[PDB]
Each structure stands twice: as structure tokens, then as C-alpha cells.
Amino acid sequence: MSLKPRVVDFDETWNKLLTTIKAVVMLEYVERATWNDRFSDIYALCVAYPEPLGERLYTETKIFLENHVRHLHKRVLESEEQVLVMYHRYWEEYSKGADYMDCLYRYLNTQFIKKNKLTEADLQYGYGPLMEIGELALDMWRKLMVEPLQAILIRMLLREIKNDRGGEDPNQKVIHGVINSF
Amino acid sequence: MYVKLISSDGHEFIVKREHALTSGTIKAMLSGPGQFANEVNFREIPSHVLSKVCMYFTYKVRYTNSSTEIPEFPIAPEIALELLMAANFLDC
Amino acid sequence: MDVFLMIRRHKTTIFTDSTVFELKRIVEGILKRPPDEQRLYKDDQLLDDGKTLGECGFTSQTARPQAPATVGLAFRADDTEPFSSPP
Amino acid sequence: IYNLIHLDPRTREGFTLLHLAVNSNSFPNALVTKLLLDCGAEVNAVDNEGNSALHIIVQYNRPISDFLTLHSIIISLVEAGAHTDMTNKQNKTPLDKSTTGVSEILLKTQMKMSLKCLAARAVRANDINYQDQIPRTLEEFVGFH
């Protein structure tokens, strides 16, 4: 049966989820027998007889995303004269990374989160922040990857467009992706 | 257009694809690196519960938006709890 | 559409909604087996062919989605358990 | 407006602002209900007798009076959240307490069934120890259903 609430240990489950949650932010192969089984572990954590453990999981997955965001900043801020392609090759992967992970955290979004958050009415007219996984990975790309970099990205574009005006053959897809990112 | 469903006990069940998309979790397990190119392996569900879970889909799809008065689902008292803790997981 | 039965077989169960030849055809289309290889062991007797399911005996009013009827099709051999104990 | 509904001004028998707004003391004001719901209020509220918003408008008793306004509050209630099978202070449902045959058929257009609802009833009707053997969250959900 094995569906009634039990007692679980954070370390054993979290040192097992990390390996498979690190291979989905960058596209690789995961067996079709582990993607189906780890759907029963994120449920066991949310129902533990001594105490719920969801908040610690949320705190830890934020820190996991932070380091992955920050290391790509290191790799890009030192790329020379070819920043544009380097900003596209990783944006394309990281965009598909988020929605393939949002599915794995459906239970957290449905039950724990969205129940203690702010209402749309609270957002409007002032008066009155917990935020959903898969939309949290899109607010650590704005603050640590483009805002610390919004000089070179604008400057290399506003001259490539001018060169195209004067006669030039730039790759349409590369430029179009970068503008579509914003 | 057919999807398999393996239970923890071992008994295997087969139902139409469109008849097994009423549950969000079964849709999530089929979207991603789990395109399975299908057989979905449940690790903590017995067989008797899964039988009635499969039976519920046809009852829901057939008697929807129908003027005819709808009958009542028969549920045995003994197993009633397990369908609840399974529908919580499957979000049916 | 008035019948809803399960083609149960050893460790397997297929769910489907006018004669037995078409049922063998569907069982083929699902399991990929020769039409002659597979036949019925319906309720301790070997059903005939050409006759519609109405003449075999199953009535629509006693075969509804809430309580489908079992149809034994364990004829895989050549060309011719209980689910679980509740706790 | 939001500053006031951010606190509960419940008075009398635990009646909320919506409960007063939806009953004849103003019996049915379509714009008032829409504005109140948009400003933000608990669509599910419990009074001394446990009745919800739907439990009050169902006994209107004047179907001819506002047969075009009795089809506004109901749709506004079902949207933005509503629970259609709560039992209060005794075994009774919004459909069960329907005094008029008009309301009994007006409701039927907008509900939807789920296995959780059909499983909840049998647990309570056939009373078994439904405490401490289930997840904590569902303990409350099996209470009003």
C-alpha cells in the first residue's frame, strides 16, 4: 500500500534528487524508469508524520538554482568578442530547463504554495514573497545575467543593426532570439 | 492511441489515451524526457484500487452533458479510504 | 453503444465498448495475434462465431460501466488470479 | 473599501458583509455583489448555522421576481470559487434545501463531479475512524464534504 504518512530523512532523499535535478536544467538523458519513480518521493516529503518538510525543500532548491545561474555568469563575462552566440546557446537550453522541471514540482505548486501567497486583489490597489517553482527560475535570469550585463548586449546590437543598414549579412536567428528573450 | 498502466502488485491494465488524460499527474508523467519512445510504472498502488480508478473514467466520459438522470457509483465501505488517498495522488 | 466488458486474460485486462469475429479482430489489433490462434472460453463454454453478442447471451441492461462483465479469452495456447484480497 | 474588508465586521449571528448583501433585510443587487467579490472577500464563509452564500439565495421564494437577476449572483458565486456540497449544522445540501423547483434546475447546469467528492461521502455516512490515518490536509476536507 505504502501511501500512508511515514517518517523520512531529508539527507537521503535530497542527496538522490540532486543528481536527476541537475541533468534536467541542461539537456541530457535520464532513464524512463527514474523519471516515473521520483514522482513518489516529492510526495512523501510533503506528508511526514513528525512535521512537514516542504519549506526546507523550497529554501534548498532556491540555493541550488543560484549557483547554476552564477557560474554561467562567470563563463560568459569572460567570453571575448563573441558574447552574442554564447548568450544564445545557454538561453535556449535554460528556457527548456524550466518547464521540464515545473512538472516535477506540481504538488508543491498546487497544495503548499498558492495557499499562502498573495492574491491578485492584494497585488492591485496596494495594501495586501512566495512564488511558484518554474517561474522562480525566470527571476534569477533577470537579476544576475542581463542586468549586470546590459551594456555590451545593447552596444554590440545597435552597431550590427547599423552595419546591416549599411550593407551586411547578419544571422537573423541569432539576433531574433536575443531580442525575443526580453 | 493506447497507454499501459503497471501496478505495484504486477497486474497490467490498458485503456485508451483520451480516456486517461482526466488526471493531471498522468499527463505530467507523459510530458518531458518521459515521452517513452507507453507504459507508466506506479510504485505504491495496489490492484483493487487501480481497477476502480480505471472504471471511473468511462463512467465520467459517457454520462456527461446528458439529460438522462445519472445513476450512483457503487463504492464498498471496506476500501473507501484507499480511493481517497489515491485520488489525492492522481488528482482525479 | 450498449455494451462495456473487459477482455480479461492471464496477467492482463483490455477495456473496449457485432459478432465475435470483430472482437477477435480487435484483440488482434491490440495484442498482434492471429485471428484463428485466439478464440473465446466465455463462461466455461466456447462461444460460436457469426452470431452477434446479443444472441450469445449478454444483455445491455445488465452490462453497464459500473459493473462490466468478464469475458475469458485465454486461448493464446496454440490456436485454441483474483485481483487482490482487501486488508 | 478593501481597508474595511481586510478586517471582519461580522455582526449578529456571524453574518458577513456578503451574507447581508445577498438576503432580504438589498435582497439581490447584481453590481454590489460583483464589486464586493472583486474587492476580495471569502467566497466560503461559515455562520452560526454554517450556511454559505448559496445556502441563503436558494430559499429566495420569488422566482418570478428577478428571474433575470437570480441568474447573476449564482454564476458570480460559482466562478472565482464555490463549494456546492457543504453540509451545515445538520445533514443538508444546497440542492436539498432548495424550496423552489426553479432553483433546483438552475443549479444543475454548473457543477462537476470528481472521485474525491464521491469517496468523501461514504466515509462519513458509513462512520469509521477517519482520524489520524490520513494526511493532515485531507482531514479538514473530509469534514464539510
Side-chain angles (χ1 to χ4, degrees), chain D residues 110-145:
Chain D
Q110 304 304 133
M111 311 86 78
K112 159 65 48 160
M113 41 175 214
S114 76
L115 179 59
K116 195 179 331 176
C117 297
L118 285 90
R121 289 186 189 83
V123 183
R124 153 159 312 178
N126 296 4
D127 38 16
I128 318 164
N129 180 21
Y130 68 107
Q131 206 73 18
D132 212 14
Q133 292 66 246
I134 61 171
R136 255 67 62 185
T137 315
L138 252 54
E139 173 38 59
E140 199 182 1
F141 184 89
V142 82
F144 42 105
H145 220 91

Short mmCIF file of all heavy atoms in Angstrom, two decimals, chain D residues 110-145:
data_model
loop_
_atom_site.label_atom_id
_atom_site.label_comp_id
_atom_site.label_asym_id
_atom_site.label_seq_id
_atom_site.Cartn_x
_atom_site.Cartn_y
_atom_site.Cartn_z
N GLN D 110 -24.09 23.88 -13.72
CA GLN D 110 -22.76 24.42 -13.47
C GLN D 110 -21.90 23.61 -12.50
O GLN D 110 -20.81 24.07 -12.14
CB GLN D 110 -22.87 25.86 -12.97
CG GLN D 110 -23.65 26.78 -13.89
CD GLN D 110 -23.09 26.81 -15.30
OE1 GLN D 110 -23.83 26.70 -16.28
NE2 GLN D 110 -21.78 26.96 -15.42
N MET D 111 -22.34 22.42 -12.07
CA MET D 111 -21.46 21.65 -11.20
C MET D 111 -20.61 20.67 -12.01
O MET D 111 -20.74 20.54 -13.23
CB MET D 111 -22.25 20.90 -10.13
CG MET D 111 -23.27 21.72 -9.37
SD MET D 111 -24.84 21.81 -10.22
CE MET D 111 -25.52 20.20 -9.82
N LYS D 112 -19.72 19.98 -11.30
CA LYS D 112 -18.83 18.98 -11.89
C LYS D 112 -18.44 18.00 -10.79
O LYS D 112 -18.20 18.39 -9.65
CB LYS D 112 -17.60 19.65 -12.52
CG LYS D 112 -16.39 18.74 -12.71
CD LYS D 112 -16.66 17.62 -13.72
CE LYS D 112 -17.29 18.15 -15.00
NZ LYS D 112 -17.12 17.21 -16.14
N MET D 113 -18.39 16.73 -11.16
CA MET D 113 -18.13 15.66 -10.20
C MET D 113 -16.67 15.23 -10.28
O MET D 113 -16.03 15.30 -11.33
CB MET D 113 -19.03 14.44 -10.47
CG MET D 113 -19.20 14.11 -11.94
SD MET D 113 -20.15 12.60 -12.20
CE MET D 113 -19.36 11.96 -13.67
N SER D 114 -16.15 14.79 -9.13
CA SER D 114 -14.79 14.27 -9.05
C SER D 114 -14.78 13.11 -8.06
O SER D 114 -15.58 13.06 -7.12
CB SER D 114 -13.79 15.34 -8.63
OG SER D 114 -13.89 15.61 -7.24
N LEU D 115 -13.85 12.17 -8.28
CA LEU D 115 -13.79 10.97 -7.46
C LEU D 115 -13.59 11.28 -5.98
O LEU D 115 -14.09 10.53 -5.13
CB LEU D 115 -12.66 10.07 -7.96
CG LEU D 115 -12.42 8.76 -7.19
CD1 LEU D 115 -13.67 7.91 -7.20
CD2 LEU D 115 -11.24 8.01 -7.78
N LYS D 116 -12.90 12.37 -5.66
CA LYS D 116 -12.71 12.74 -4.26
C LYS D 116 -14.04 13.02 -3.57
O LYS D 116 -14.26 12.59 -2.43
CB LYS D 116 -11.79 13.96 -4.16
CG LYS D 116 -11.22 14.21 -2.77
CD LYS D 116 -10.30 15.42 -2.75
CE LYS D 116 -9.62 15.65 -4.10
NZ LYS D 116 -8.80 16.89 -4.10
N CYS D 117 -14.94 13.72 -4.25
CA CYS D 117 -16.25 14.01 -3.67
C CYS D 117 -17.06 12.73 -3.45
O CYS D 117 -17.62 12.54 -2.37
CB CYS D 117 -17.02 14.98 -4.57
SG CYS D 117 -16.25 16.60 -4.75
N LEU D 118 -17.11 11.85 -4.45
CA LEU D 118 -17.85 10.61 -4.30
C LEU D 118 -17.24 9.68 -3.26
O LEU D 118 -17.97 8.86 -2.68
CB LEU D 118 -17.95 9.88 -5.64
CG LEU D 118 -18.94 10.45 -6.66
CD1 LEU D 118 -18.29 11.49 -7.55
CD2 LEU D 118 -19.54 9.33 -7.50
N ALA D 119 -15.93 9.77 -3.01
CA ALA D 119 -15.30 9.00 -1.96
C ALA D 119 -15.48 9.60 -0.57
O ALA D 119 -15.50 8.84 0.41
CB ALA D 119 -13.80 8.84 -2.24
N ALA D 120 -15.61 10.92 -0.47
CA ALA D 120 -15.74 11.55 0.84
C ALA D 120 -17.04 11.16 1.54
O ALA D 120 -17.05 10.94 2.75
CB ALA D 120 -15.65 13.07 0.70
N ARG D 121 -18.14 11.08 0.79
CA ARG D 121 -19.44 10.86 1.40
C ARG D 121 -19.50 9.52 2.13
O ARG D 121 -20.00 9.45 3.27
CB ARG D 121 -20.55 10.92 0.34
CG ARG D 121 -20.81 12.31 -0.21
CD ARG D 121 -22.01 12.29 -1.14
NE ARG D 121 -22.18 13.55 -1.85
CZ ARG D 121 -21.53 13.88 -2.96
NH1 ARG D 121 -20.65 13.06 -3.51
NH2 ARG D 121 -21.77 15.05 -3.53
N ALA D 122 -19.01 8.45 1.50
CA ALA D 122 -19.13 7.12 2.08
C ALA D 122 -18.37 7.00 3.39
O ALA D 122 -18.75 6.20 4.26
CB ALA D 122 -18.64 6.07 1.09
N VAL D 123 -17.30 7.78 3.56
CA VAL D 123 -16.53 7.72 4.80
C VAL D 123 -17.37 8.21 5.97
O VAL D 123 -17.33 7.64 7.07
CB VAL D 123 -15.23 8.54 4.66
CG1 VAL D 123 -14.40 8.43 5.92
CG2 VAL D 123 -14.44 8.06 3.45
N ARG D 124 -18.15 9.28 5.76
CA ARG D 124 -18.91 9.86 6.86
C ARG D 124 -20.25 9.15 7.04
O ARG D 124 -20.67 8.87 8.17
CB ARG D 124 -19.12 11.35 6.62
CG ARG D 124 -20.37 11.93 7.27
CD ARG D 124 -20.24 13.43 7.43
NE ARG D 124 -18.96 13.79 8.02
CZ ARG D 124 -18.56 15.04 8.24
NH1 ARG D 124 -19.32 16.07 7.93
NH2 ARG D 124 -17.36 15.25 8.78
N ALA D 125 -20.93 8.83 5.93
CA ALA D 125 -22.23 8.17 6.02
C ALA D 125 -22.09 6.80 6.69
O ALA D 125 -22.89 6.45 7.57
CB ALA D 125 -22.84 8.03 4.63
N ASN D 126 -21.09 6.03 6.29
CA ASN D 126 -20.73 4.79 6.96
C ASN D 126 -19.57 5.11 7.89
O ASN D 126 -18.41 5.04 7.50
CB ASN D 126 -20.37 3.71 5.95
CG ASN D 126 -21.54 3.33 5.06
OD1 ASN D 126 -22.62 3.92 5.15
ND2 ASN D 126 -21.33 2.34 4.20
N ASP D 127 -19.90 5.49 9.13
CA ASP D 127 -18.92 6.06 10.03
C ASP D 127 -17.83 5.06 10.39
O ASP D 127 -18.10 3.97 10.89
CB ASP D 127 -19.60 6.57 11.30
CG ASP D 127 -20.73 5.66 11.76
OD1 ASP D 127 -20.80 4.51 11.29
OD2 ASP D 127 -21.56 6.11 12.58
N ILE D 128 -16.58 5.45 10.12
CA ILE D 128 -15.40 4.70 10.52
C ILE D 128 -14.43 5.70 11.14
O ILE D 128 -14.63 6.91 11.02
CB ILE D 128 -14.76 3.95 9.33
CG1 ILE D 128 -15.84 3.32 8.44
CG2 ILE D 128 -13.82 2.86 9.81
CD1 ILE D 128 -15.33 2.90 7.08
N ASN D 129 -13.38 5.21 11.80
CA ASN D 129 -12.39 6.08 12.42
C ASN D 129 -11.58 6.74 11.31
O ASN D 129 -10.59 6.17 10.83
CB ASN D 129 -11.49 5.29 13.36
CG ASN D 129 -10.44 6.16 14.03
OD1 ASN D 129 -10.59 7.38 14.12
ND2 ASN D 129 -9.37 5.54 14.51
N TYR D 130 -11.99 7.94 10.91
CA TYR D 130 -11.33 8.70 9.86
C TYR D 130 -10.31 9.70 10.40
O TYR D 130 -10.01 10.70 9.74
CB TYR D 130 -12.36 9.41 8.98
CG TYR D 130 -13.12 10.52 9.68
CD1 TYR D 130 -12.85 11.85 9.39
CD2 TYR D 130 -14.10 10.24 10.62
CE1 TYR D 130 -13.54 12.87 10.02
CE2 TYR D 130 -14.79 11.25 11.26
CZ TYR D 130 -14.51 12.57 10.96
OH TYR D 130 -15.20 13.58 11.59
N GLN D 131 -9.77 9.45 11.59
CA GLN D 131 -8.84 10.36 12.24
C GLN D 131 -7.50 9.68 12.45
O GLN D 131 -7.45 8.53 12.89
CB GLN D 131 -9.39 10.85 13.59
CG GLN D 131 -8.86 12.21 14.02
CD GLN D 131 -9.46 13.35 13.22
OE1 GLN D 131 -10.49 13.19 12.56
NE2 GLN D 131 -8.81 14.50 13.26
N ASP D 132 -6.43 10.39 12.12
CA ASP D 132 -5.03 10.06 12.35
C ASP D 132 -4.50 8.98 11.40
O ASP D 132 -3.34 8.57 11.55
CB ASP D 132 -4.74 9.63 13.80
CG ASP D 132 -3.35 10.02 14.26
OD1 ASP D 132 -2.70 10.83 13.57
OD2 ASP D 132 -2.91 9.50 15.31
N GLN D 133 -5.29 8.50 10.44
CA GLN D 133 -4.81 7.52 9.46
C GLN D 133 -4.78 8.11 8.06
O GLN D 133 -4.66 7.38 7.07
CB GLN D 133 -5.66 6.25 9.48
CG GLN D 133 -5.53 5.40 10.74
CD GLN D 133 -6.07 6.07 11.99
OE1 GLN D 133 -5.33 6.39 12.91
NE2 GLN D 133 -7.38 6.30 12.01
N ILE D 134 -4.88 9.44 7.95
CA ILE D 134 -4.89 10.12 6.66
C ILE D 134 -3.98 11.33 6.73
O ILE D 134 -3.62 11.80 7.82
CB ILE D 134 -6.31 10.55 6.25
CG1 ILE D 134 -6.89 11.54 7.26
CG2 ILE D 134 -7.22 9.35 6.08
CD1 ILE D 134 -8.19 12.17 6.82
N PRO D 135 -3.55 11.84 5.57
CA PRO D 135 -2.78 13.09 5.56
C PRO D 135 -3.52 14.21 6.27
O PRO D 135 -4.76 14.26 6.28
CB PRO D 135 -2.59 13.39 4.07
CG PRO D 135 -2.84 12.11 3.36
CD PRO D 135 -3.48 11.13 4.29
N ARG D 136 -2.75 15.13 6.86
CA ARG D 136 -3.33 16.16 7.72
C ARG D 136 -4.29 17.06 6.95
O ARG D 136 -5.35 17.43 7.46
CB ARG D 136 -2.22 16.99 8.36
CG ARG D 136 -1.98 16.69 9.82
CD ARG D 136 -1.42 15.28 10.01
NE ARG D 136 -0.14 15.12 9.35
CZ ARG D 136 0.53 13.97 9.27
NH1 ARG D 136 0.05 12.86 9.81
NH2 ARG D 136 1.70 13.94 8.64
N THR D 137 -3.93 17.43 5.71
CA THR D 137 -4.74 18.38 4.95
C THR D 137 -6.13 17.82 4.66
O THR D 137 -7.13 18.53 4.77
CB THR D 137 -4.03 18.75 3.65
OG1 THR D 137 -2.64 19.01 3.92
CG2 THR D 137 -4.65 19.99 3.04
N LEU D 138 -6.21 16.54 4.29
CA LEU D 138 -7.49 15.97 3.90
C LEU D 138 -8.42 15.78 5.09
O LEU D 138 -9.63 15.55 4.91
CB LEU D 138 -7.28 14.63 3.18
CG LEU D 138 -7.53 14.66 1.68
CD1 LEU D 138 -6.72 15.77 1.02
CD2 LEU D 138 -7.22 13.32 1.05
N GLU D 139 -7.89 15.87 6.31
CA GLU D 139 -8.73 15.73 7.49
C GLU D 139 -9.80 16.81 7.53
O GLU D 139 -10.97 16.53 7.79
CB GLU D 139 -7.87 15.78 8.75
CG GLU D 139 -8.62 15.81 10.08
CD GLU D 139 -9.86 14.93 10.08
OE1 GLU D 139 -9.73 13.71 9.86
OE2 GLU D 139 -10.97 15.46 10.33
N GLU D 140 -9.42 18.06 7.26
CA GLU D 140 -10.41 19.13 7.17
C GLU D 140 -11.33 18.96 5.97
O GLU D 140 -12.55 19.17 6.10
CB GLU D 140 -9.71 20.49 7.10
CG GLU D 140 -10.61 21.65 7.48
CD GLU D 140 -9.92 22.99 7.35
OE1 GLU D 140 -8.73 23.01 6.95
OE2 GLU D 140 -10.55 24.02 7.66
N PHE D 141 -10.79 18.59 4.81
CA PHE D 141 -11.60 18.44 3.61
C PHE D 141 -12.67 17.37 3.74
O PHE D 141 -13.75 17.52 3.15
CB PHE D 141 -10.71 18.12 2.40
CG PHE D 141 -11.45 18.05 1.10
CD1 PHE D 141 -11.63 19.19 0.33
CD2 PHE D 141 -11.97 16.85 0.64
CE1 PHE D 141 -12.32 19.13 -0.87
CE2 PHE D 141 -12.66 16.79 -0.55
CZ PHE D 141 -12.83 17.93 -1.31
N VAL D 142 -12.41 16.31 4.50
CA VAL D 142 -13.42 15.28 4.74
C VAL D 142 -14.41 15.70 5.82
O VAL D 142 -15.31 14.94 6.17
CB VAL D 142 -12.75 13.94 5.10
CG1 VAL D 142 -12.36 13.90 6.57
CG2 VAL D 142 -13.65 12.76 4.73
N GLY D 143 -14.28 16.92 6.33
CA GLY D 143 -15.16 17.41 7.37
C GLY D 143 -16.44 18.03 6.86
O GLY D 143 -17.53 17.68 7.33
N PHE D 144 -16.34 18.96 5.91
CA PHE D 144 -17.54 19.64 5.43
C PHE D 144 -18.16 18.91 4.24
O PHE D 144 -19.32 19.15 3.90
CB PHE D 144 -17.23 21.09 5.06
CG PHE D 144 -15.94 21.29 4.30
CD1 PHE D 144 -15.96 21.56 2.95
CD2 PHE D 144 -14.72 21.27 4.96
CE1 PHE D 144 -14.79 21.76 2.25
CE2 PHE D 144 -13.55 21.47 4.26
CZ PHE D 144 -13.58 21.72 2.91
N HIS D 145 -17.41 18.01 3.61
CA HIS D 145 -17.93 17.24 2.49
C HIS D 145 -18.54 15.93 2.97
O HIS D 145 -19.30 15.91 3.93
CB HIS D 145 -16.84 16.97 1.46
CG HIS D 145 -17.30 17.08 0.04
ND1 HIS D 145 -17.24 18.26 -0.68
CD2 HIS D 145 -17.84 16.16 -0.80
CE1 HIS D 145 -17.72 18.06 -1.89
NE2 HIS D 145 -18.09 16.79 -1.99
#
